[PDB]
Amino acid sequence: MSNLSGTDKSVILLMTIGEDRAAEVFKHLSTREVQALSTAMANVRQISNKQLTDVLSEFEQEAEQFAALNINANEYLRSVLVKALGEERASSLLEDILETRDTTSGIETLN
């Protein structure tokens, strides 16, 4: 069991899944993590078959133990709010929801 960093292991998983699947997994990722994983797969070292197998086995375990729900986490928001309070109050609440997530820099405050 070599010292396989989890970022490199996630790189390996992104390699094994495939192109469109990798892009889909990317689309649910934040920009900083995207750059981190891009640099990791830039300086990626080739992996042995046994370490590959260990990484894929533990990843399958994690996916099996953690897979559930995440059905409509964002659009369910809007549909429930619209069917509940109508379009204007649904939009007000949704704007409050999306603005609760703070900027990191004052530039986005300007936005």
Partner 1 sequence: KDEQLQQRRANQRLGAEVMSQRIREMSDNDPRVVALVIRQWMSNDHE
* Radius of gyration, alpha carbons of the chain: 19
User: How many Å apart are CA 47 and CA 45, to the nearest integer?
Assistant: 6
Partner whose footprint covers residue 3, from a copy of itself, partner 1, none (CB < 5 to 8 Å by kind): none
User: How many Å apart are CA 9 and CA 11, to the nearest integer?
Assistant: 5
110 binds a copy of itself (CB under 8 A): no
Provide the mask over 20-39, with x wherever binding to a copy of itself is found by CB under 8 A and - wherever it is not. x-xx--xx------xx--xx
80 binds partner 1 (CB under 8 A): no
- Which ranges constitute the DSSP H helices of the chain? 6-17, 19-27, 31-42, 49-66, 75-100, 106-110
Q: How many CB atoms neighbour CB 93 within 10 A? A: 17
Partner whose footprint covers residue 111, from a copy of itself, partner 1, none (CB < 5 to 8 Å by kind): none
Q: How far is the CB of 8 from a copy of itself (least distance, A)?
A: 11
27 binds partner 1 (CB under 8 A): yes
48 binds a copy of itself (CB under 8 A): yes
Return the number of the residue (25 or 93) whose C-beta is nearest partner 1. 25
